[PDB]
Write a protein that binds this ligand. Structure first.
Ligand SMILES: [Zn+2]
Ligand SMILES: [Zn+2]
Lengths: 223, 223
């Protein structure tokens, strides 16, 4: 596709101008990420997560470190609707902010339902002790653009907190073409990582990979 | 099968995350072993054992030292039903506990009825005099992963106490996939072993091989 990045001439502020296909990045009114400040308290449906030990591959596509799921079986159910986990990746530092706070890292679990409707479940990481559950992925992390098949099974359920309360809002993909119509569920409970793990990620990717926050406009964030 | 153990990243706490087939190890509500503290006094049916000198082979499968029975003929009858002894193995230290007490060793005599329903008869060993009845097995014990044919016939009846009174509860296999629906009969009368016999076992297996005790939950132990 058309080349884009986080630094230089093809930075986020230039995404909508580097290709007609990326126009929504600059003209969209329902863009992600956002800075969650004010919220409307509401009775949100409980999410049911059904992740399991699976055979996955880890790739460095030059924009992030992504863990792919070629086989089905890992799903998230919310309000009677089932979404299949396609992949999960990270951003260092975080893209979304809570009351203006940027976190060391943020993970995005990308799902699709039967009708190709996208849903992103987000996990924020605070600076703290080493994350032992991410060690498997970090150990085989391609330091240059490429894909490697994780030989041992990986269970993404280990990456989710016990309590699944979340913030909900409508948004878009945070990378070109910035497609809208994406459901965003940001978990309110944070996980942790150390400086070394975050630094290694930036090394592999080549730069910080977070898109600046976008205005909420007509949207409200439910909590 | 997927690798699992008692030490490192594949320890008992992570079994349920190693493969989807091991999921019951972490989600099961009727898991073994257990710490027998409170019990209900009941009229339990008598156990009838009909073991005989048989041709067996001793095996070191990396998880325990197991004595395999290629042919039937060694049976245990309780409450009208007959179970055939398939094999017996050991755990050092013991898996099950009696009022918080861990024993130097525990033997598991695994049986299966006509319909493949599992029944485990357990014998606990106290530290004491050398066990002369186990010498035949201990002397040929493979110190590395392998199987050796026992040249002389072995009669498992010599490994059972005179008094066959027992504790009765429903549980599971104490190793992956942690299958439930297993009937557990733990003998009240203990046998003995020397410290040397126990340490030789540990040396052969590579580590202690006892799964931590599990919550009884809705279960009651009868005696
Ligand atoms: Zn992302
Ligand atoms: Zn056992």
């Amino acid at each position: 596709h058309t080349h884009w990045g986080y630094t230089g001439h093809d930075s986020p502020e230039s995404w909508g101008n580097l290709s007609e296909e990326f126009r929504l990045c600059s003209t969209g009114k329902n863009q992600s990420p956002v800075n969650i400040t004010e919220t409307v308290s509401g009775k949100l449906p409980a999410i049911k997560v059904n992740y399991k030990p699976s055979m996955v591959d880890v790739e460095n596509n030059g924009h992030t470190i992504q863990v792919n799921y070629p086989e089905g079986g890992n799903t998230l159910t919310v309000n009677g609707r089932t979404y299949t986990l396609k992949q999960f990746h990270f951003h260092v530092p975080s893209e979304n902010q809570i009351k203006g706070r940027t976190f060391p890292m943020e993970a995005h679990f990308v799902h699709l339902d039967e009708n190709k409707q996208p849903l992103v479940l987000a996990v924020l990481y605070e600076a703290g002790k080493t994350n032992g559950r991410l060690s498997s992925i970090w150990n085989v992390m391609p330091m240059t653009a490429g894909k490697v098949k994780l030989n041992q099974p990986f269970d993404a359920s280990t990456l989710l907190p016990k309590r699944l309360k979340y913030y909900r809002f409508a948004g878009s993909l945070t990378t070109p073409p910035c497609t809208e119509g994406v459901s965003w569920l940001v978990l309110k409970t944070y996980d942790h990582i150390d400086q070394a793990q975050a630094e290694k990620f930036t090394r592999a990717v080549g730069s910080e990979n977070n898109r600046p926050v976008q205005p909420l406009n007509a949207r409200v964030v439910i909590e």
